[PDB]
Structure 1
Amino acid sequence: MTEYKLVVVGAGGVGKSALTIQLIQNHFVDEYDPTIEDSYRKQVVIDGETCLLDILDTAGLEEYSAMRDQYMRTGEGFLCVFAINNTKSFEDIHQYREQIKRVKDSDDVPMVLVGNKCDLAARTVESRQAQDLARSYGIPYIETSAKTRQGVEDAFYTLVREIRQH
């Protein structure tokens, strides 16, 4: 059936792996093992359509960000993740936006801005601030929690729906 190539990007430790693993394997990864480049595949029915999701979990740490550009090349949609308790991760979203533009050589790439770790109380990035950023890119802003699963499916499914509008 239809295959959707999704790519998760964002600063180190924002929760890219936890989000992906919660979506695909249904459990929360409590420990922090820096990622180099991992891929996941799973058949799911979205809006009545049986589709194959190929999700690339990329490195947020520069030290593990080797040929990251090459892996992302085939990506059809991207989740740009920051953590609501990490202001710097939010401020650096533009870096990932720029990288995506380069790898895809396009200004119109399906995307979703994700504010992860919404279960944490030390929030320094208010929803409104993220909504303004997303609005400027013309993309949806969705908050998630890889820990409680809140907004997790919504984030990935919305990305599929954005690819469909593409």
Structure 2
Amino acid sequence: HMTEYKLVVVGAGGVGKSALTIQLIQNHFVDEYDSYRKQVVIDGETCLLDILDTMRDQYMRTGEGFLCVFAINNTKSFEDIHHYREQIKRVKDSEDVPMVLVGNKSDLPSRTVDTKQAQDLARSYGIPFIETSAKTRQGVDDAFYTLVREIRKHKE
């Protein structure tokens, strides 16, 4: 019928995991803030996205792809990515897990993490880096779509 993709958004508090997710589902930005579902067509395949915004360690073990989110104006969040990724490495017992690195809040002027740093990090892990803003919606569809396509590159 349709095809199910189980996605997991991880990252430090306050980076905009919820805002990103709410943006994908409901097409608005919320300033103050479980599992979600969205039917989308991506490359002519109707997809049901089963999305957790982080006793829900059963999404960690079963989840097929991970958005690793930091904010570009939060250097601590960027440094923490190493830990979120090591957590996903341990749970899946492998260094080849579908993953996208996301740099959120690209609208904000107070940028403490440079695109080169992010690119250096993503290149080391062997994954895409995408800049997003949940406020303007820049990059949001592209982060989720690319993660869907990363999952396709790894098994049917």
Is TM more than 0.5 here? yes
Residues 70, 103 of structure 1: 8 Å contact kept: no
**Which whole-Å CA distance do the structure 1 matches of 2:12 and 2:123 have between them?**
21
CA contact (8 A) 1:85 1:117 kept: yes
Does 2:45 match 1:49?
yes
- Conserved 8 A contact 1:111-1:162: yes
Query: What is the rounded CA distance, in whole Å, between the counterparts of 2:61 and 2:9 in structure 1?
Result: 12
- Aligned-partner Cα distance in 1 for 2:46–2:14: 32
Which ranges in structure 1 are unaligned for 5 or more consecutive residues? 33-37, 59-66
Residue 71 (structure 1) shift: 3.2
Cα distance in 2 for residues equivalent to 1:11 and 1:68: 17
Q: Which residue of 1 aligns with 2:24?
A: 23
User: Is 1:4–1:53's contact at 8 Å kept on the other side of the alignment?
Assistant: yes
Contact 1:21/1:28 (<8 A) preserved = yes
> What does residue 130 of structure 2 align with?
142
CA distances 1:15-34 after superposition (whole Å, capped 9, x unpaired): 000000000111111114xx
| C-alpha distance in structure 1 between counterparts of 2:14 and 2:91, whole Å | 23
Percent of aligned pairs with the same amino acid: 93
Any idea what SS the aligned residue of 2:62 has?
coil
What is the aligned residue count? 153
- For 1:150 and 1:21, the matched residues in 2 are separated by 14
1:9/1:16 contact within 8 Å kept: yes
Q: Deviations over 1:42-78 (max 9, x none)?
A: 11100111111100110xxxxxxxx353332110000
Distance in 2 between residues matched to 1:152 and 1:50, nearest whole Å: 18
Deviation at 1:98, TM superposition (A): 0.7
CA RMSD of aligned residues (A): 0.9
Q: Secondary structure at the match of 1:150?
A: coil
- Superposition TM-score, scaled by structure 2 size: 0.95
* 1:103 CA displacement: 1.8
CA distance in 2, matches of 1:74, 1:29: 29
Contact 1:69–1:103 under 8 Å retained in 2 = no
When residues 95 and 127 of structure 1 are mapped into structure 2, their CA distance, relative to the original with a 3 A threshold, is: same
Aligned-partner Cα distance in 1 for 2:21–2:35: 9
Contact 1:9/1:79 (8 A) holds in 2: yes
Per-residue displacement from partner, 1:121-158 (whole Å, max 9, x unpaired)? 10000001100100000000000000000000000000
TM-score (norm. length: structure 1): 0.89
Runs of 4+ aligned structure 1 residues displaced above 4 Å come to: none
* Offset at residue 106 of structure 1 (A): 1.8
Q: Distance in 1 between matches of 2:12 and 2:86?
A: 14
